[PDB]
Design an enzyme around this catalytic site. Structure first.
Site: not given
Ligand SMILES: *[C@@H]1O[C@H](CO)[C@@H](O)[C@H](O)[C@H]1NC(C)=O
Length: 218
Positions: A116, A200
């Site tokens: 990621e 986030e």
């Protein structure tokens, strides 16, 4: 349009806007997304309020491009992107970040991978990426703090800006090339599964306005 449903999505042209409230259970509150315009560039905003689960991400409300046909990182010539955004809110503990998954298997699910890559243009509050700091690095003419860690079997590299980069233009290939040439990342064998941009949040109240976002794989 607007929706607060956990997995609401809105699609237009080559973009998808998603609420993606995957960590809702870790706190109390809500998340909503509004897709404003998806012709050419994407314009949308994310709204939320969360308490509890101090160090647990509650969601990743985001825009992403469609990637029907997966290709290796080295085969891709450029991954240009632009972003224009601003946060508003109270006691914000959240980031503003690109998220991309890659895997050696071109048929891997697109919501995880072997690796990621995150690029944090924004960060409010005391929070930080998974893992530990590997020092600063220069990519695309901007300085970033590089973090590295594990999320299960997945290796996560997060490049964090030195100030809130609310107007951005870059090429994500520059980040993959840095990993390939300095951290043994196998760009020749890894396929790009997703190319996303969003926030986030942990706690607080906020609205992320994305006035303009573009991205492509060429
Ligand atoms: C964003 O701005 C706030 C205050 O100006 C600061 O605390 C935070 O570190 C900034 N984020 C980045 C990525 O530099």
């Amino acid at each position: 349009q607007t929706s607060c449903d956990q997995y609401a999505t809105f699609s237009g042209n080559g973009y998808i806007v998603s609420n993606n409230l995957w960590g809702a259970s870790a706190g109390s509150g809500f998340g909503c997304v509004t897709s404003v315009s998806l012709n050419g560039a994407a314009s949308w905003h994310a709204d939320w309020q969360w308490s509890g689960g101090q160090n647990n991400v509650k969601s990743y409300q985001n825009v992403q491009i469609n990637i029907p046909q997966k290709r290796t990182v080295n085969s891709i010539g450029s991954m240009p992107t632009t972003a224009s955004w601003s946060y508003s809110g109270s006691d914000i503990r959240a980031n503003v970040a690109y998220d991309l998954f890659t895997a050696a298997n071109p048929n891997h699910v697109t919501y995880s991978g072997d690796y990621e890559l995150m690029i944090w243009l924004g960060k409010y509050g005391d929070i930080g990426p998974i893992g530990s700091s590997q020092g600063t690095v220069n990519v695309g003419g901007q300085t970033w703090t590089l973090y590295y860690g594990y999320n299960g079997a997945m290796q996560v590299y997060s490049f964090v800006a030195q100030s809130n980069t609310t107007s951005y233009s870059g090429d994500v290939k520059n980040f993959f090339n840095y990993l390939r040439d300095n951290k043994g990342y196998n760009a020749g064998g890894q396929y790009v599964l997703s190319y996303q941009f969003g926030t986030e949040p942990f706690t607080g109240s906020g609205t992320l306005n994305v006035a303009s976002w573009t991205a492509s794989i060429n």
